[PDB]
Amino acid sequence: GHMATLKVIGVGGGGNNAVNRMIDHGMNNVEFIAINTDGQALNLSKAESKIQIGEKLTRGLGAGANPEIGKKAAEESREQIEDAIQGADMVFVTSGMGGGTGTGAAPVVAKIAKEMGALTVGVVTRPFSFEGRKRQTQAAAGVEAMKAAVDTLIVIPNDRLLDIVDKSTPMMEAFKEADNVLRQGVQGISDLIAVSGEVNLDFADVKTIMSNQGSALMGIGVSSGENRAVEAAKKAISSPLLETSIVGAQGVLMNITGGESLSLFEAQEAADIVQDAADEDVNMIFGTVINPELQDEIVVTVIATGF
């Protein structure tokens, strides 16, 4: 009975905002850690564990949009970061790229987690085009440093939020759509670990698909009625918010959850939808859960890696 320890680590302002809004959902088995230079913002974190990094460097302020200060701050506090990560089997490092603390400290946090043997997944945003070319270039250097430091990376370009709002959608409601990329991935792994499937997948399968595998997609689709399996699988692989599409995926961990009505035929239909985008040589690990509490709903979940 292996019970994998998951930790979610927010780094910098945007990363800790996302963690705060996830905590408001009361996610149970996951440990949340807040890392920031900015002591004012950190004091408002809802996370159980708070690490103020770089206090001697920034005097308790943020990094002032300087990634070099964010990096140095994380290095100054390496021992406190190590202490906080201790015991993790999987770490999600979440951060907004383009500022000073996330850009510079998130790759250091990720490297420390990977050095300690944890499966390390980064979930980061790129800045809106309206924030300027300079911020975008700073963020892209952060993205590349994150790629070098993580097992798998999910990139959310903030510009994609402009594809799902109308002219009146509140900014905070838009931000919750981006938060949900992180939330569904964390929750989905948590479910995989906790629940015993009829075709059972576990953390070792997650490790095979995600360890040292570059870009990643973590998606979920829910549908009912006619064509529910095709529609749910299409939703799981078709988020408007991701940079990396599933085209070309070399690894897929896929699960279908339904009630007792879940048919073998619709399992095939869902798998074929996902296969018809991945590489012909994709390593597919397919699982199934029968949840008799469900009636007509089917849930398809996909991890796709390897581009």
Ligand X SMILES: Nc1nc2c(ncn2[C@@H]2O[C@H](COP(=O)(O)OP(=O)(O)O)[C@@H](O)[C@H]2O)c(=O)[nH]1
243 binds ligand X (CB under 6 A): no
CA–chain centroid gap for 251, Å, is 17
Among all chains, which residue has been given the structure tokens 């991945």?
Answer: 278
Rounded to an integer, what distance in angstroms lies between the CA atom of residue 187 and that of residue 299? 13
Restricted to residues 218-237, the positions that interact with ligand OMW (CB under 6 A) are 218-220
Q: Kind of pairing, strands 298-305 and 283-290?
A: unpaired
Q: Using the rule CB under 6 A, which residue among 45, 58, 101, 255 binds ligand X?
A: 101
Q: Which is nearer to ligand OMW, 199 or 204 (CB)?
A: 199
- Taking CA atoms, 54 is separated from 51, 64, 89, 132, in Å, by 10, 12, 26, 27
76, containing H or E segment: helix 67-76
Listed ranges 12-20, 47-55, 113-121, 289-297: which one lies at the site for ligand X (CB under 6 A): 12-20
Contacts with K ion, 185-214, as mask; x by CB under 5 A = ------------x--x--------------
For 287, residues 6+ apart whose C-beta sits below 8 A from its C-beta are 192, 197, 199, 200, 201, 205, 253, 254, 255, 256
Q: Which two tokens stand for residue 69?
A: 């200060």
Between 78-85 and 67-76, two packed helices, what is the crossing angle to 10 degrees? 70
- Strand-pairing partners, residue 8, are 32, 92
Q: Which of residues 128-187 bind ligand OMW (CB under 6 A)?
A: 184-185
Which partner in K ion, ligand OMW, ligand X, none is near 189 (CB below 5 to 8 A by kind)?
ligand OMW
Among 86, 200, 227, 263, binds ligand OMW (CB under 6 A): 200
Contacts for 213 with CB less than 8 Å, ≥ 6 apart: 151, 152, 250, 251, 305, 306
CA distances in angstroms from 265 to 81, 268, 269, 270, listed in the order given: 48, 5, 6, 9
Query: Which of the stretches 120-128, 147-155, 190-198, 262-270 binds ligand X when contact is defined by CB under 6 A?
Result: 120-128
| CB of 14 or CB of 185, closer to ligand OMW | 185
Binding-site positions for GTP: 13-17, 100-102, 131, 135, 179
Does residue 282 touch ligand OMW according to CB under 6 A? no
- Residues contacting ligand X: total by CB under 6 A: 20
CA distance 61 to 64: 8
Q: Which two tokens stand for residue 184?
A: 């569904």
Give the residue, chosen from 20, 94, 125, 257, that forms a contact with ligand X under the rule CB under 6 A: 125
Of 197 and 248, nearer to K ion (C-beta) is 197
Q: What is the smallest separation between the CB atom of 260 and ligand X, expressed in angstroms?
A: 40
Q: Least separation, in Å, of the C-beta of 302 and ligand OMW?
A: 6
Residue written as token pair 């931000």: 175
- Candidates 253, 270, 271, 274; binder of ligand OMW (CB under 6 A) is 253
Can you read off the two tokens belonging to residue 111?
A: 């490297």
Q: CB 203 → ligand OMW: shortest distance, Å?
A: 10
Residues that bind ligand X (CB under 6 A): 12-14, 17, 62-63, 96, 98-102, 125, 127-128, 131, 135, 158, 175, 178
